[PDB]
Design a protein around this nucleic acid. Structure first.
Ligand code: SAM
Ligand code: ZN
Ligand code: ZN
Ligand code: ZN
Lengths: 103, 110, 97, 82, 222, 98, 86, 109, 95
DNA sequence: CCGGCACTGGAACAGGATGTATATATCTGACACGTGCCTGGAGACTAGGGAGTAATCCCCTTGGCGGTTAAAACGCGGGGGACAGCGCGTACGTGCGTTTAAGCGGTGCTAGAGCTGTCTACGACCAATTGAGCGGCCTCGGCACCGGGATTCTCCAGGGGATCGGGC
DNA sequence: GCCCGATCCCCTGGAGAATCCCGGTGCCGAGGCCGCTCAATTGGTCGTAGACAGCTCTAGCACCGCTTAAACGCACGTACGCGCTGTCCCCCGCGTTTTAACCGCCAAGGGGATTACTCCCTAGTCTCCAGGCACGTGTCAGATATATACATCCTGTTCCAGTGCCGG
């Protein structure tokens, strides 16, 4: 007897294009700082034991990792659009890196 | 020191230190000797490359109703100029984001 | 206090060239470091290419002529045609008086 | 006091954000275990050179210029830290 | 039986009553399109307007098209036409009097703002007398658009399993708003309808007396 | 009926022939007349050594042979075996030249 | 002073001369429009190297493009070349 | 000079000239003062590197049943070892050819 | 006239006759090994220079020349050559 | 309602033709060797400072603790995009007859790289002095946040003139 | 036939209403004002790198003739780009409950950045001699052509499986 009137959900491809135009306008960092900082201190524990990092040294690896990944995902997209698709697959990254030189 | 002092910048008419560039050329192990007009030439090519970027940065900072240059405007300043994008090809500017660009085949057709 | 030691930079010449092309805008602190680094990065390329020019030819001096060729080798098409002009003018104005 | 498993800190939405800034519209489901594998080999080649530059100066702290020089050694200059 | 509907305070915008507040934005949280001084319809219907494809409301002060961008369709308010006609046993229903095209800005859906706890209290209060509460639409959490007490000529919009118009969800000036649009262009004289989904808290004793081939179902089942 | 080899073999067995010799694959005089002409736009009346024209032929060949190696991966990416003009531009754009 | 004007020499990079490079790279079937694009790709790589060779020459006040100017011009782009004197 | 001449490369047991490495270091504008155990360390590395690209070129040249070494053998002994292929990555070897390699999708069936 | 043109020819040839006594080498091959050495030399020394300049020093020492090897040679080369060098340096002093 | 004289489809391997390879004559020009000479590397001292070593001061890296809340995790539905299979036709691979420059030897020649002798202007080096540049301390104010009237507009409001159903 | 106590298209008395104008207040960061100290300007002295003027000689440009390998048209038939259709499944949007990232504190000590002081290790001259570079030379490894020997590629004439389809 009692009901509500909910509107129709967004068509697939709308909340994915809004974020593309939103994040391509901000300038923040996109990975959680503490989880990224524990990862660095774990990786560098294989070269010299019990060493220390500066506050703006853990903050400099993070501004290079992001600019590496964001520029890798721009050259993956072109391979995906080349193969006549919309979805980027696990076999686009490999061709991207191979042609670029890293492998 | 029997006469009136003048810097070497005001002689050439520059705003960069012709006295400081000479010292870096000497104490940097570039050659055994250094000519006399090498700093005067190297500073006038540094003020020009600085003007050419600060002007574009100010232009792009004016077009957001803002009055102060922050690191995003320097990114938008070089990424749109065909020669500065080639001079700074492999260079990351901290907190600059990227350029607005959606591929023309992704937009919802009709 | 130990009177912290002085550390030089181009942070007051970058701030003087700006008031010639925009007499009213400002610049940010974290965006002045970028111009500082840009100058420190372009100075080294243009000097380390003149080094090699003067060494290929078995010379022992950097002159106002190795720097002119290093600029033509480093700067792109149109940049490297006003930079040479500004250089060759700021030396004529200096050797005259 | 050892660490492990902390690679799961680059979570799934955290990769979707980086992809959206890249420009991609749809995303497969096996990208999330392949991106964590490209990241963990970009960090090693840089932290190795940072730790070497440090040990050469007899220090015990990976300062902020070690990272800038280690990134310059691979043609990835980084403006804004030194 | 020439009586009339019980009075409803005709209103043009929304009114805040409960514990909810307003989130009016400034001229810096509004996206900017890629249009330009162009044909008669900038940011128009067929015009590949970035905002229009993404269900945003353009703004007269930020768009390069000046002020004539035809995307500003939540202030002009160029609405449908003649009111309640008589149906068989339903309350009154409505219909159209002027013909429209396919995918046009048909009237909005406007009323009062109510929160969930006030909503549950209002429906339970209206339940003891079995007033048959019928006007209750939601959009996000802790924000429910109500059209019972007051509203607009969008409140007597009939339900069907084979509709004619649809209920979208646009974003106008920082806030989210609901605007009904047309599926298929229609000449003047067919009674407008749109489907909607329900949420049962008790039992189901309601049938879809709309009239179609599969439309029997239930008021919560397609 | 002159035995008519089937398409796809006379190419597949010259692939494996040109990948064992190390000669030069462009004609000497036609290539030299081109280098001398590109270098009229920069200074009139130049003169090339004999070993300066052979230093550019090898660079050019080693550039093209390794551009086609990357072309032949995009074409296989798209599920083809031929290489069209749209495969070269993708390779260049991912390397970073265009 | 014989300066016999040169013209349209880019067509000396014939069709078989490109099929051979494509074969050495590992290509099985070639389309029909690659021939007009490979010449455009080559005439751009050649300018960026001959320009620098001529620059290195003008700085030494000579008139003969030597075999070391080319090696240096190539090494300046990350294309080191062994075998011609380094 | 009561004592007899003894080259500085024999004191170390090497074959590369420590006497010439030192001079090329000093007169190459690399720094102001050049240490005394620096050339003895640099020559020992230069000599070890040129004794790993030759131990492989010899083996590559003995499978073609030849006695001399030609540029093709150096390209083969460089692009078949994964460490030298990473050190000499962006380097062209004149008269080198390419590695025999033909994709697995184009093969007949 | 025809003054000189020094090169590492007669040392590369000496190193060859230790790993393959019955083997020769062509002129072209020689003119490739020569450039290989001339190129690795100024790729290692050009890093010792920058190291000494980053630490505000003036002497190139075995420590700079050794660290410049771990930043250039990859993997197992960086671990073999370093031990190959600490042998020569050790033998030099005790002489 | 399932089969028999004679039909219909599916599989495979020798037999050529080609191509890459097997062992030899022959020969020639480039690689490996002495030989003589010069110049750069080795031996021995001597003087000045760049770096090794010990001791301080304080910056700042790491370590807990609690509290608010935004972002990560999980499961349910519904539809758009990835993938396979057919079908048509267009463009490129293969083989042959023929025209057109590339390649290989002599020959001439002169323009310009290369080398040596004088010598003169130009940059390193030293002492002193004074003004620019850096660290620190105060500022002023252009803007973020609130109010205060309060103007423009409606809106709820019952009410001043028509309206009438009977009323007279 | 005229008229009257209640009853409705319209009106406006306050009340509201809500939002433009205009004005205070409080700030992270920037923009200026002095105390300091030490690096850049001036003025000379001095010795070598670099600019000219020859002068030899070699090697890059230009020509001519001859043989034959490579470029060029041309025709055919076929393998393969490319569009279309169907199907299903896996990636996206929308809720709910859980977890750990952020922020704001306080707290104790590792080690980075200085500074003072005394070696010992490198630059720099002489003095002397042998390792390495150019030159002329012999002789043999590898490049040709000749001839024959198997691998590979492609097909077409034999070779099972089942029935064509007709029927009693
Ligand atoms: C907008 S009200 C309709 C009121 C009235 N019947 C009218 O049309 O004016 C919507 C409510 O009507 C009830 N209803 C069910 N079927 C209906 C139908 N076929 N037409 C109109 N209302 C319906 C539902 O319970 C729903 O809550
Ligand atoms: Zn628009
Ligand atoms: Zn608009
Ligand atoms: Zn129905």
């Amino acid at each position: 007897t009692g009901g509500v009137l909910k509107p129709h959900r967004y068509r697939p491809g709308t909340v994915a294009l809004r974020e593309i135009r939103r994040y391509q306008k901000s300038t923040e960092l996109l990975i959680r700082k503490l989880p990224f900082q524990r990862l660095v201190r774990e990786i560098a524990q294989d070269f010299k034991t019990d060493l220390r990092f500066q506050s703006s040294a853990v903050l400099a690896l993070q501004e290079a990792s992001e600019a590496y990944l964001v520029g890798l995902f721009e050259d993956t997209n072109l391979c995906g659009i080349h193969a006549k698709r919309v979805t980027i697959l696990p076999k686009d990254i490999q061709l991207a890196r191979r042609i670029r030189g890293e492998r | 020191t029997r006469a009136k002092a003048k810097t070497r910048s005001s002689r050439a008419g520059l705003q960069f230190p012709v006295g400081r560039v000479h010292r870096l050329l000497r104490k940097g192990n570039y050659a055994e000797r250094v000519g006399a007009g090498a700093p005067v030439y190297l500073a006038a090519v540094l003020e020009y490359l600085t003007a050419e970027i600060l002007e574009l940065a100010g232009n792009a900072a004016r077009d957001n109703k803002k009055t102060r240059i922050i690191p995003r405007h320097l990114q938008l300043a070089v990424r749109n100029d065909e020669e500065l994008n080639k001079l700074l090809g492999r260079v990351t500017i901290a907190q600059g984001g990227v350029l607005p660009n959606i591929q023309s085949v992704l937009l919802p057709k009709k | 206090k130990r009177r912290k030691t002085r550390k030089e930079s181009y942070a007051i010449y970058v701030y003087k060239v700006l008031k010639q092309v925009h007499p009213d805008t400002g610049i940010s602190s974290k965006a002045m470091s970028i111009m500082n680094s840009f100058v420190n990065d372009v100075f080294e390329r243009i000097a380390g290419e003149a080094s090699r020019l003067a060494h290929y030819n078995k010379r022992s001096t950097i002159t106002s002529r190795e720097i002119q060729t290093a600029v033509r080798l480093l700067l792109p098409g149109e940049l490297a045609k006003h930079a040479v002009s500004e250089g060759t003018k700021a030396v004529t104005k200096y050797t005259s008086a | 006091k050892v660490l492990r498993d902390n690679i799961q800190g680059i979570t799934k939405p955290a990769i979707r954000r980086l992809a959206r800034r890249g420009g991609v519209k749809r995303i497969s489901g096996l990208i999330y275990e392949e991106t964590r594998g490209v990241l963990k080999v970009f960090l090693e080649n840089v932290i190795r050179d940072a730790v070497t530059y440090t040990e050469h100066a007899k220090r015990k702290t990976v300062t902020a210029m070690d990272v800038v020089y280690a990134l310059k050694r691979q043609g990835r200059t980084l403006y804004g830290f030194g | 039986n020439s009586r009339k509907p019980p009075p409803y305070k005709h209103i043009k915008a929304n009114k805040v009553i409960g514990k909810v507040q307003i989130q009016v934005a400034d001229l810096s949280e509004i996206p900017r399109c890629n249009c330009k001084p162009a044909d008669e319809n900038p940011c128009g219907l067929e015009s590949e307007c970035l905002n229009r494809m993404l269900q945003y409301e353009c703004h007269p002060q930020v768009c390069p098209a000046g002020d004539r961008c035809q995307n500003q369709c939540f202030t002009k308010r160029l609405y449908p036409d003649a009111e309640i006609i008589k149906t068989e046993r339903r309350g009154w229903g409505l219909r159209t009097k002027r013909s429209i095209k396919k995918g046009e800005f048909v009237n909005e859906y406007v009323g009062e703002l109510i929160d969930e706890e006030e909503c549950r209290l209002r429906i339970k209060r209206a339940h003891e007398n079995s007033v048959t509460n019928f006007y209750m639409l939601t959009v996000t959490k802790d924000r429910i658009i109500d059209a019972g007490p007051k509203g607009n000529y969008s409140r007597f919009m009939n339900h069907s399993c084979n509709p004619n118009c649809e209920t979208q969800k646009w974003t106008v000036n920082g806030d989210v708003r609901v605007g009904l649009f047309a599926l298929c262009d229609i000449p003047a004289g067919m009674e407008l309808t749109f489907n909607y989904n329900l949420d049962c808290l008790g039992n189901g004793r309601t049938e879809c007396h709309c009239g179609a081939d599969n439309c029997s179902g239930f008021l919560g089942v397609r």
